[PDB]
Enzyme design. Sequence first.
Site, PDB file in Angstrom:
ATOM      1  N   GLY A  16       0.803  -1.218   0.000  1.00 55.63           N
ATOM      2  CA  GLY A  16       0.000   0.000   0.000  1.00 55.63           C
ATOM      3  C   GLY A  16       0.833   1.264   0.000  1.00 55.63           C
ATOM      4  O   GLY A  16       1.678   1.477   0.890  1.00 55.63           O
ATOM      5  N   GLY A  18       0.890   5.463   0.138  1.00 54.59           N
ATOM      6  CA  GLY A  18       0.089   6.501   0.804  1.00 54.59           C
ATOM      7  C   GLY A  18       0.810   7.804   1.103  1.00 54.59           C
ATOM      8  O   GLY A  18       1.823   8.121   0.474  1.00 54.59           O
ATOM      9  N   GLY A  19       0.275   8.552   2.071  1.00 53.56           N
ATOM     10  CA  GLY A  19       0.748   9.914   2.401  1.00 53.56           C
ATOM     11  C   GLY A  19       1.042  10.121   3.882  1.00 53.56           C
ATOM     12  O   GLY A  19       2.063  10.714   4.241  1.00 53.56           O
ATOM     13  N   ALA A  21       0.602   7.170   5.754  1.00 56.97           N
ATOM     14  CA  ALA A  21       0.674   5.731   6.091  1.00 56.97           C
ATOM     15  C   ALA A  21       1.184   4.778   4.954  1.00 56.97           C
ATOM     16  O   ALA A  21       0.858   4.936   3.763  1.00 56.97           O
ATOM     17  CB  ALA A  21      -0.678   5.246   6.622  1.00 56.97           C
ATOM     18  N   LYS A  22       1.990   3.794   5.363  1.00 60.32           N
ATOM     19  CA  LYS A  22       2.534   2.756   4.492  1.00 60.32           C
ATOM     20  C   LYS A  22       1.790   1.488   4.872  1.00 60.32           C
ATOM     21  O   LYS A  22       1.223   1.403   5.959  1.00 60.32           O
ATOM     22  CB  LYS A  22       4.042   2.556   4.741  1.00 60.32           C
ATOM     23  CG  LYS A  22       4.859   3.838   4.980  1.00 60.32           C
ATOM     24  CD  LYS A  22       6.126   3.568   5.799  1.00 60.32           C
ATOM     25  CE  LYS A  22       6.647   4.811   6.503  1.00 60.32           C
ATOM     26  NZ  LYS A  22       7.406   5.715   5.592  1.00 60.32           N
ATOM     27  N   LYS A  38      -0.773  -1.939   8.511  1.00 60.80           N
ATOM     28  CA  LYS A  38      -0.872  -0.525   8.195  1.00 60.80           C
ATOM     29  C   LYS A  38      -0.116   0.238   9.264  1.00 60.80           C
ATOM     30  O   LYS A  38      -0.400   0.110  10.452  1.00 60.80           O
ATOM     31  CB  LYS A  38      -2.329  -0.050   8.143  1.00 60.80           C
ATOM     32  CG  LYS A  38      -2.460   1.429   7.808  1.00 60.80           C
ATOM     33  CD  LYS A  38      -3.888   1.839   7.568  1.00 60.80           C
ATOM     34  CE  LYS A  38      -3.978   3.236   6.980  1.00 60.80           C
ATOM     35  NZ  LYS A  38      -3.574   3.270   5.549  1.00 60.80           N
ATOM     36  N   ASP A 130     -17.155   7.785   4.842  1.00 60.91           N
ATOM     37  CA  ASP A 130     -16.160   7.997   3.774  1.00 60.91           C
ATOM     38  C   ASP A 130     -16.133   6.846   2.774  1.00 60.91           C
ATOM     39  O   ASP A 130     -15.063   6.301   2.444  1.00 60.91           O
ATOM     40  CB  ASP A 130     -14.765   8.211   4.370  1.00 60.91           C
ATOM     41  CG  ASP A 130     -13.817   8.915   3.400  1.00 60.91           C
ATOM     42  OD1 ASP A 130     -14.302   9.553   2.434  1.00 60.91           O
ATOM     43  OD2 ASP A 130     -12.594   8.839   3.596  1.00 60.91           O
TER      44      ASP A 130
END
Length: 316
Positions: A16, A18-19, A21-22, A38, A130
Amino acid sequence: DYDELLKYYELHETIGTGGFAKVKLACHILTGEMVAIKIMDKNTLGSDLPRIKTEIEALKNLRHQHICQLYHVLETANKIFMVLEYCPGGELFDYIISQDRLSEEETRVVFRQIVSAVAYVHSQGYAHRDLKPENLLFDEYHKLKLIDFGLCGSLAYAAPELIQGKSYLGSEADVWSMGILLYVLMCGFLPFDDDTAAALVAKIMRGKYDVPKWLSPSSILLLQQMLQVDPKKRISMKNLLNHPWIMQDYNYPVEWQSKNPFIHLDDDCVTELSVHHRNNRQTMEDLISLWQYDHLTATYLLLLAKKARGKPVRLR
Ligand SMILES: CCOc1cc(OCC#Cc2ccc3ccncc3c2)ccc1C[NH3+]
Protein backbone atom coordinates in the site's frame (compact mmCIF):
# COMPACT_ATOMS: atom_id res chain seq x y z
CA ASP A 1 9.49 1.92 16.85
CA TYR A 2 9.63 -1.61 15.41
CA ASP A 3 11.20 -3.64 18.19
CA GLU A 4 8.02 -5.19 19.66
CA LEU A 5 6.36 -5.56 16.22
CA LEU A 6 9.28 -7.60 14.83
CA LYS A 7 9.07 -10.02 17.76
CA TYR A 8 5.69 -11.13 16.31
CA TYR A 9 5.88 -10.43 12.53
CA GLU A 10 8.37 -10.84 9.67
CA LEU A 11 8.06 -7.97 7.17
CA HIS A 12 7.78 -8.71 3.44
CA GLU A 13 7.09 -6.17 0.61
CA THR A 14 5.35 -2.81 0.71
CA ILE A 15 1.98 -3.12 -0.93
CA GLY A 16 0.00 0.00 0.00
CA THR A 17 1.23 3.42 -1.18
CA GLY A 18 0.09 6.50 0.80
CA GLY A 19 0.75 9.91 2.40
CA PHE A 20 0.38 9.58 6.19
CA ALA A 21 0.67 5.73 6.09
CA LYS A 22 2.53 2.76 4.49
CA VAL A 23 1.22 -0.81 4.30
CA LYS A 24 3.37 -3.93 4.44
CA LEU A 25 2.77 -7.57 3.71
CA ALA A 26 3.97 -9.65 6.66
CA CYS A 27 3.96 -13.13 8.15
CA HIS A 28 2.57 -13.74 11.65
CA ILE A 29 5.38 -15.87 13.06
CA LEU A 30 3.48 -18.17 15.44
CA THR A 31 0.77 -19.26 12.95
CA GLY A 32 2.63 -18.69 9.66
CA GLU A 33 -0.33 -16.68 8.27
CA MET A 34 0.03 -13.63 6.05
CA VAL A 35 -1.37 -10.26 7.19
CA ALA A 36 -1.30 -6.63 6.01
CA ILE A 37 0.20 -4.14 8.48
CA LYS A 38 -0.87 -0.53 8.20
CA ILE A 39 1.74 1.78 9.67
CA MET A 40 0.40 5.15 10.85
CA ASP A 41 2.56 7.94 12.31
CA LYS A 42 1.25 9.78 15.39
CA ASN A 43 2.93 13.13 14.78
CA THR A 44 1.89 13.13 11.11
CA LEU A 45 -1.69 12.46 12.30
CA GLY A 46 -1.60 15.39 14.77
CA SER A 47 -5.09 16.23 16.08
CA ASP A 48 -6.64 13.45 13.97
CA LEU A 49 -5.11 11.09 16.53
CA PRO A 50 -8.42 10.99 18.55
CA ARG A 51 -10.67 10.52 15.52
CA ILE A 52 -8.39 7.70 14.23
CA LYS A 53 -8.46 5.97 17.67
CA THR A 54 -12.26 6.25 17.81
CA GLU A 55 -12.52 4.58 14.41
CA ILE A 56 -10.04 1.85 15.46
CA GLU A 57 -12.29 1.30 18.48
CA ALA A 58 -15.30 0.99 16.12
CA LEU A 59 -13.47 -1.57 13.97
CA LYS A 60 -12.78 -3.74 17.06
CA ASN A 61 -16.58 -4.19 17.30
CA LEU A 62 -17.14 -5.21 13.68
CA ARG A 63 -16.97 -8.77 12.44
CA HIS A 64 -18.29 -9.43 8.94
CA GLN A 65 -17.51 -11.28 5.72
CA HIS A 66 -17.31 -7.97 3.74
CA ILE A 67 -15.38 -5.99 6.32
CA CYS A 68 -11.60 -6.24 6.58
CA GLN A 69 -10.77 -8.09 9.82
CA LEU A 70 -8.62 -6.41 12.47
CA TYR A 71 -6.16 -8.82 14.29
CA HIS A 72 -3.87 -6.59 16.39
CA VAL A 73 -3.27 -2.95 17.34
CA LEU A 74 0.22 -2.13 18.58
CA GLU A 75 1.11 1.38 19.79
CA THR A 76 4.57 2.81 20.38
CA ALA A 77 6.10 6.26 21.03
CA ASN A 78 5.46 7.52 17.47
CA LYS A 79 3.46 4.81 15.67
CA ILE A 80 0.21 2.88 15.56
CA PHE A 81 0.33 -0.44 13.71
CA MET A 82 -2.87 -2.07 12.54
CA VAL A 83 -2.58 -5.75 11.68
CA LEU A 84 -5.31 -6.60 9.22
CA GLU A 85 -6.67 -9.26 6.86
CA TYR A 86 -4.52 -9.34 3.70
CA CYS A 87 -6.69 -8.55 0.64
CA PRO A 88 -4.57 -9.45 -2.42
CA GLY A 89 -6.95 -8.27 -5.23
CA GLY A 90 -6.26 -4.54 -4.73
CA GLU A 91 -8.61 -1.55 -4.66
CA LEU A 92 -12.01 -1.44 -6.36
CA PHE A 93 -10.68 1.90 -7.73
CA ASP A 94 -7.97 0.28 -9.87
CA TYR A 95 -10.37 -2.53 -10.90
CA ILE A 96 -12.92 -0.01 -12.26
CA ILE A 97 -10.21 1.83 -14.24
CA SER A 98 -8.74 -1.47 -15.58
CA GLN A 99 -12.13 -2.49 -17.03
CA ASP A 100 -13.37 0.98 -18.01
CA ARG A 101 -16.83 0.20 -16.56
CA LEU A 102 -18.52 -2.93 -15.18
CA SER A 103 -21.48 -4.72 -16.77
CA GLU A 104 -24.80 -4.20 -15.09
CA GLU A 105 -24.76 -7.74 -13.78
CA GLU A 106 -21.19 -7.49 -12.39
CA THR A 107 -21.99 -4.15 -10.74
CA ARG A 108 -25.06 -5.79 -9.13
CA VAL A 109 -22.87 -8.62 -7.65
CA VAL A 110 -20.33 -6.15 -6.30
CA PHE A 111 -22.89 -3.58 -5.13
CA ARG A 112 -24.80 -6.14 -3.09
CA GLN A 113 -21.54 -6.84 -1.16
CA ILE A 114 -21.16 -3.08 -0.43
CA VAL A 115 -24.75 -2.88 0.81
CA SER A 116 -24.17 -6.03 2.93
CA ALA A 117 -21.19 -4.46 4.67
CA VAL A 118 -22.73 -1.00 5.15
CA ALA A 119 -26.05 -2.35 6.42
CA TYR A 120 -24.09 -4.35 9.03
CA VAL A 121 -22.10 -1.25 10.07
CA HIS A 122 -25.40 0.61 10.59
CA SER A 123 -26.90 -2.34 12.56
CA GLN A 124 -23.97 -2.06 15.02
CA GLY A 125 -24.74 1.65 15.59
CA TYR A 126 -22.06 3.15 13.32
CA ALA A 127 -21.81 4.92 9.97
CA HIS A 128 -18.83 4.83 7.64
CA ARG A 129 -19.08 8.40 6.25
CA ASP A 130 -16.16 8.00 3.77
CA LEU A 131 -17.40 5.39 1.32
CA LYS A 132 -15.50 5.52 -1.99
CA PRO A 133 -13.67 3.00 -4.18
CA GLU A 134 -10.34 3.57 -2.44
CA ASN A 135 -11.95 2.26 0.76
CA LEU A 136 -13.01 -1.04 -0.90
CA LEU A 137 -10.58 -3.94 -1.51
CA PHE A 138 -10.96 -7.32 -3.25
CA ASP A 139 -9.75 -10.51 -1.56
CA GLU A 140 -8.30 -13.51 -3.49
CA TYR A 141 -11.87 -14.73 -4.23
CA HIS A 142 -12.64 -11.28 -5.66
CA LYS A 143 -15.05 -10.56 -2.76
CA LEU A 144 -15.19 -6.96 -1.42
CA LYS A 145 -13.74 -6.01 1.92
CA LEU A 146 -14.65 -2.60 3.37
CA ILE A 147 -11.72 -0.69 4.84
CA ASP A 148 -11.25 2.93 5.97
CA PHE A 149 -8.50 5.66 6.08
CA GLY A 150 -7.87 5.13 2.37
CA LEU A 151 -6.55 7.92 0.19
CA CYS A 152 -10.85 16.76 -4.55
CA GLY A 153 -10.64 13.32 -2.84
CA SER A 154 -13.81 12.12 -1.11
CA LEU A 155 -15.54 15.50 -1.72
CA ALA A 156 -17.05 13.88 -4.85
CA TYR A 157 -18.58 11.09 -2.72
CA ALA A 158 -19.87 13.42 0.04
CA ALA A 159 -23.60 14.05 0.62
CA PRO A 160 -24.91 17.67 0.24
CA GLU A 161 -25.94 18.01 3.91
CA LEU A 162 -22.55 16.59 4.88
CA ILE A 163 -20.76 19.11 2.61
CA GLN A 164 -22.44 22.07 4.27
CA GLY A 165 -21.64 21.18 7.90
CA LYS A 166 -25.28 20.98 8.96
CA SER A 167 -27.04 18.24 10.93
CA TYR A 168 -27.18 14.86 9.26
CA LEU A 169 -27.66 11.13 9.84
CA GLY A 170 -24.58 9.05 9.06
CA SER A 171 -26.79 6.30 7.56
CA GLU A 172 -28.29 8.76 5.06
CA ALA A 173 -24.85 10.12 4.10
CA ASP A 174 -23.76 6.50 3.48
CA VAL A 175 -26.72 5.91 1.12
CA TRP A 176 -25.79 8.99 -0.93
CA SER A 177 -22.17 7.79 -1.18
CA MET A 178 -23.31 4.29 -2.24
CA GLY A 179 -25.33 6.04 -4.99
CA ILE A 180 -22.17 7.79 -6.26
CA LEU A 181 -20.36 4.38 -6.13
CA LEU A 182 -23.23 2.78 -8.08
CA TYR A 183 -22.88 5.43 -10.80
CA VAL A 184 -19.11 5.01 -11.02
CA LEU A 185 -19.33 1.22 -11.20
CA MET A 186 -21.72 1.40 -14.16
CA CYS A 187 -20.18 4.49 -15.87
CA GLY A 188 -16.43 4.57 -15.08
CA PHE A 189 -16.69 8.29 -14.20
CA LEU A 190 -18.32 10.44 -11.52
CA PRO A 191 -21.82 11.94 -11.69
CA PHE A 192 -20.55 15.25 -10.23
CA ASP A 193 -17.08 16.33 -11.35
CA ASP A 194 -15.05 19.53 -11.65
CA ASP A 195 -11.69 21.32 -11.55
CA THR A 196 -12.29 23.17 -8.28
CA ALA A 197 -14.03 22.66 -4.93
CA ALA A 198 -16.61 25.45 -5.37
CA ALA A 199 -17.69 24.15 -8.79
CA LEU A 200 -17.89 20.57 -7.62
CA VAL A 201 -19.89 21.56 -4.52
CA ALA A 202 -22.27 23.72 -6.56
CA LYS A 203 -23.05 20.74 -8.84
CA ILE A 204 -23.55 18.35 -5.89
CA MET A 205 -26.04 20.76 -4.28
CA ARG A 206 -28.05 21.13 -7.50
CA GLY A 207 -28.13 17.34 -7.85
CA LYS A 208 -28.21 17.23 -11.67
CA TYR A 209 -26.09 14.72 -13.61
CA ASP A 210 -25.80 13.15 -17.07
CA VAL A 211 -27.40 9.76 -17.72
CA PRO A 212 -25.33 7.73 -20.21
CA LYS A 213 -27.28 5.92 -22.92
CA TRP A 214 -26.11 2.48 -21.79
CA LEU A 215 -27.83 2.80 -18.37
CA SER A 216 -30.93 0.62 -18.09
CA PRO A 217 -34.22 2.24 -17.06
CA SER A 218 -34.15 0.32 -13.74
CA SER A 219 -30.57 1.50 -13.04
CA ILE A 220 -31.71 5.05 -13.76
CA LEU A 221 -34.61 4.78 -11.24
CA LEU A 222 -32.39 3.37 -8.45
CA LEU A 223 -29.78 6.10 -9.00
CA GLN A 224 -32.41 8.80 -8.59
CA GLN A 225 -33.68 7.24 -5.33
CA MET A 226 -30.13 7.15 -3.88
CA LEU A 227 -29.01 10.56 -5.16
CA GLN A 228 -31.76 12.69 -3.64
CA VAL A 229 -30.37 16.01 -2.42
CA ASP A 230 -32.96 16.11 0.42
CA PRO A 231 -31.95 13.32 2.84
CA LYS A 232 -35.61 12.73 3.85
CA LYS A 233 -36.40 11.76 0.18
CA ARG A 234 -33.41 9.39 -0.10
CA ILE A 235 -34.06 5.64 -0.12
CA SER A 236 -33.62 3.95 3.29
CA MET A 237 -31.34 0.99 3.92
CA LYS A 238 -34.46 -1.06 4.64
CA ASN A 239 -35.78 -0.45 1.12
CA LEU A 240 -32.41 -0.87 -0.55
CA LEU A 241 -31.94 -4.40 0.89
CA ASN A 242 -34.85 -5.80 -1.17
CA HIS A 243 -34.99 -3.25 -3.99
CA PRO A 244 -36.24 -4.62 -7.39
CA TRP A 245 -32.95 -3.71 -9.12
CA ILE A 246 -30.94 -5.34 -6.30
CA MET A 247 -32.91 -8.60 -6.78
CA GLN A 248 -33.07 -8.47 -10.58
CA ASP A 249 -30.52 -11.28 -11.24
CA TYR A 250 -30.54 -13.09 -7.87
CA ASN A 251 -34.07 -12.93 -6.45
CA TYR A 252 -33.30 -12.75 -2.71
CA PRO A 253 -32.70 -9.73 -0.43
CA VAL A 254 -29.12 -8.78 0.50
CA GLU A 255 -27.71 -11.10 3.21
CA TRP A 256 -26.33 -8.31 5.41
CA GLN A 257 -26.11 -10.28 8.64
CA SER A 258 -22.70 -11.43 9.83
CA LYS A 259 -22.02 -15.01 8.70
CA ASN A 260 -19.30 -15.70 11.27
CA PRO A 261 -20.13 -13.70 14.41
CA PHE A 262 -18.14 -14.25 17.63
CA ILE A 263 -20.46 -16.40 19.80
CA HIS A 264 -18.33 -18.52 22.09
CA LEU A 265 -14.61 -19.12 21.91
CA ASP A 266 -13.60 -21.91 19.52
CA ASP A 267 -12.47 -24.89 21.62
CA ASP A 268 -9.76 -26.14 19.22
CA CYS A 269 -8.14 -22.68 19.10
CA VAL A 270 -8.27 -22.41 22.94
CA THR A 271 -6.81 -25.89 23.30
CA GLU A 272 -3.86 -25.08 21.05
CA LEU A 273 -3.24 -21.74 22.78
CA SER A 274 -3.37 -23.50 26.19
CA VAL A 275 -0.73 -26.09 25.20
CA HIS A 276 1.44 -23.37 23.76
CA HIS A 277 1.23 -20.86 26.62
CA ARG A 278 1.43 -23.61 29.26
CA ASN A 279 -1.95 -22.51 30.68
CA ASN A 280 -5.06 -24.48 31.67
CA ARG A 281 -8.28 -23.92 29.65
CA GLN A 282 -10.12 -21.63 32.09
CA THR A 283 -7.10 -19.33 32.51
CA MET A 284 -6.56 -19.16 28.73
CA GLU A 285 -10.25 -18.42 27.97
CA ASP A 286 -10.16 -15.70 30.62
CA LEU A 287 -7.15 -14.05 28.93
CA ILE A 288 -8.62 -14.30 25.41
CA SER A 289 -12.00 -12.87 26.57
CA LEU A 290 -10.35 -9.53 27.49
CA TRP A 291 -10.12 -8.94 23.68
CA GLN A 292 -7.26 -6.46 23.99
CA TYR A 293 -6.29 -6.76 20.26
CA ASP A 294 -2.81 -7.59 21.48
CA HIS A 295 -0.68 -10.48 20.17
CA LEU A 296 -2.95 -13.02 21.94
CA THR A 297 -6.07 -11.68 20.17
CA ALA A 298 -4.14 -11.83 16.83
CA THR A 299 -3.03 -15.40 17.44
CA TYR A 300 -6.54 -16.51 18.38
CA LEU A 301 -8.16 -14.92 15.32
CA LEU A 302 -5.50 -16.27 12.99
CA LEU A 303 -5.91 -19.85 14.35
CA LEU A 304 -9.65 -19.40 13.80
CA ALA A 305 -8.94 -18.39 10.17
CA LYS A 306 -6.69 -21.54 9.80
CA LYS A 307 -9.51 -23.74 11.00
CA ALA A 308 -11.93 -22.06 8.59
CA ARG A 309 -9.58 -23.05 5.76
CA GLY A 310 -9.40 -26.66 6.92
CA LYS A 311 -5.78 -26.38 8.05
CA PRO A 312 -4.50 -27.97 11.25
CA VAL A 313 -5.05 -25.66 14.22
CA ARG A 314 -1.41 -25.54 15.13
CA LEU A 315 1.21 -23.02 16.25
CA ARG A 316 4.77 -23.34 15.02
C1 LIG B 1 -15.96 -0.87 8.17
C2 LIG B 1 -14.46 -0.76 8.08
O1 LIG B 1 -14.00 0.09 9.12
C3 LIG B 1 -12.66 0.40 9.21
C4 LIG B 1 -11.65 -0.11 8.39
C5 LIG B 1 -10.31 0.27 8.56
O2 LIG B 1 -9.37 -0.27 7.71
C6 LIG B 1 -7.96 0.14 7.74
C7 LIG B 1 -7.26 -0.54 6.67
C8 LIG B 1 -6.68 -1.09 5.79
C9 LIG B 1 -5.95 -1.78 4.70
C10 LIG B 1 -5.18 -1.03 3.82
C11 LIG B 1 -4.49 -1.64 2.80
C12 LIG B 1 -4.56 -3.04 2.64
C13 LIG B 1 -3.89 -3.73 1.61
C14 LIG B 1 -4.01 -5.10 1.52
N1 LIG B 1 -4.75 -5.82 2.37
C15 LIG B 1 -5.40 -5.19 3.35
C16 LIG B 1 -5.35 -3.80 3.54
C17 LIG B 1 -6.03 -3.15 4.56
C18 LIG B 1 -10.00 1.16 9.58
C19 LIG B 1 -10.99 1.67 10.40
C20 LIG B 1 -12.33 1.30 10.23
C21 LIG B 1 -13.38 1.87 11.15
N2 LIG B 1 -14.24 2.88 10.46
